[PDB]
Amino acid sequence: VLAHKGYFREARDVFAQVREATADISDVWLNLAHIYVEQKQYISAVQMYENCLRKFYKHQNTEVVLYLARALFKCGKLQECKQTLLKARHVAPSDTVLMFNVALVLQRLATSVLKDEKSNLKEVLNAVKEL
Amino acid sequence: RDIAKGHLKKVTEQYPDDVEAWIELAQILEQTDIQGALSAYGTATRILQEKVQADVPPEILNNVGA
Amino acid sequence: RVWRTRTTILQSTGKNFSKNIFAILQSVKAREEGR
């Protein structure tokens, strides 16, 4: 509720103090990772989502995969962001939100390739068809 | 329960052939020491066969499984 | 006999949260009252 009320400063400290007692509540990991994204410490968030996926999900959980994609986007792992959302679309292609995010990552990668003329032909051809 | 666990431990330490002291300890250990409960149920299983020479009750085996 | 129930499943292994979170609520309660 403090997080919904916008009090992330205290909410993070609370989620951390709850996490100290147990490593098996994903929401505590997820709440901490969300605040880490909001606090722009994207590496830590990505690390939490990657290990959360490996520990708690016997399959790639699209919710965690999407949270990871949101962090990866900001984390500069555009390659992994692309790959993570392509994996997500491979897992849930009828979920139009994930499909949008795939299209968005293709757009953001192409934006970089298209801005700098140093980008090569295979990159530009991929960027054109991907875009 | 903690006082009971401490005393029942003393009972098993003084009388390791006391199958009941081990299982009662196991019953408390189930909450806090699953391996301890396994150790107690296993010990009761072992004592019955070797020293009391009576067959092992299935409850002990079920608890070992659980 | 089963030790983990719908009530105990919600309880920590050994850490008590009351003292710290109530200290946090000491800060939050003032904000909720607009002080």
């Binding site: 997820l30 986007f73 | 409960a37 | 983990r4 105990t8």
Partner: peptide, 27 residues
């Protein structure tokens, strides 16, 4: 100017109920 578009993900601060504990019963 249009505020910068983030990855489309509905923000959920969760407090999910734990799975009901139906652990094996001791005798």
């Amino acid at each position: 100017l249009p505020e910068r578009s983030g990855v489309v993900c509905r923000v959920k601060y969760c407090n999910s109920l734990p799975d009901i504990p139906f652990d094996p019963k001791f005798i």
